Amino acid sequence: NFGQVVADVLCEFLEVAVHLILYVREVYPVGIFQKRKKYNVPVQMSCHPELNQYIQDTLHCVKPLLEKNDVEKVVVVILDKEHRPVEKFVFEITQPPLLLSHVEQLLRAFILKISVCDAVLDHNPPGCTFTVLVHTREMEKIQVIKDFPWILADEQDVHMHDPRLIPLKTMTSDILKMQLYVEERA
C-alpha cells in the first residue's frame, strides 16, 4: 500500500540528518557547510563533493534494506583520530505490519532536535571523521554498481565501553516507530 514512499521519505531524511549531525558535532570544519531549507527549517549541508558522494553512496545502499523493512538501526558513528568511537547517533527504526503532513512534522521534529543537541552533549575531541553502521540480517548489487562495498563492522565499533545515553526524539505513528538517541563514552 505505502512502503516505497515511506522508504523514499525516510532515506532522504537520513541524508539530511547525517549532514546536520556532522555540522553540529563539528566533524568537518563549519566552512564546508552552506545553509539550506529542508522540512521548512534551517539546516546545514556539506558542499564538499567527495563527502557528499560518500553520504549519498552509503544511503543509496541503505535504501533497498529500508524498502523491504530490513533496517533495525542506522547509526552515524563519530570516530577520533585513532579510529575509536567517541559518539554515536543511533536512529532505531521499526516498521511494524500492520492494520503525510504528519510524517513531515514528525521528521522535522528530529531535525530540530539535532540542531540544538549541542545543548545536551559533551563537546568532542579534536581531529574526527565518521562512519555509518547498519544493523540488519543475512543490496549486493548496488554495492557492485557504486564501487562502494560493505563489510562486517569491527567489534571495537559495535561495542562502546560503558556508554552514556542521551535520547533526543521519538515518533510513534502507525506506519513508523523511530527513536533517535546518542551514545557518549565517559
Binding site: I32, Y54, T129, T131, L133, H135, T136, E138, L152
Partner: peptide, 23 residues
C-alpha cells in the same frame, strides 16, 4: 542471523577536506 555492517571505504578525512577548504 543479526549482523552489523559498515561501508568498507572511510569518509574523507578532516585534513583532506580542510585542504579543499583552503585551496
Amino acid at each position: 542471523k543479526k549482523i552489523v555492517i559498515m561501508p568498507c571505504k572511510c569518509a574523507p578525512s578532516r585534513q583532506l577536506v580542510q585542504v579543499w577548504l583552503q585551496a
